[PDB]
Amino acid sequence: DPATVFRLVAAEALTLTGADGTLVAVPADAAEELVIVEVAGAVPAEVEASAIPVQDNAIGQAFRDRAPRRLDVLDGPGLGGPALVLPLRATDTVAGVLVAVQGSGARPFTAEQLEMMTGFADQAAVAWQLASSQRRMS
């Protein structure tokens, strides 16, 4: 189940960044909402299945503009501190948006961490695209 990839992405992102928490938001299936399908670390389990608007916020923006982004501050579903916003960019589709989140008063993410996680996010989108295509092949 391709959705399983997103769980591994959330888990590995938490390990690689050492951030307080991570989440992955995915279009349900032009989208007007993303849904948080996976959560790790300090992001409460209860946030899973949350609907995120595509418009007027950094997570939905990344889903549209395919631009990885570091933020000093990201509020709900962020945790108040720095964040990395990492679209999972496949060929001609965005699979979802991975977000690594810190509580207030954490150091900002470096450009190098952004670069590293952009690579991870790219590789993750390939993993997901492959899994999705294997499923259609049945």
UniProtKB/TrEMBL annotation:
Domain (GAF) ranges? 1-138
Which residues of the complete protein appear here? 232 to 373 of 571
Which organism is the protein's source? Answer: Mycolicibacterium smegmatis (strain ATCC 700084 / mc(2)155) (Mycobacterium smegmatis)
The protein's name in its UniProt record: GAF family protein
**Can you tell which superkingdom this protein's organism belongs to?**
Bacteria
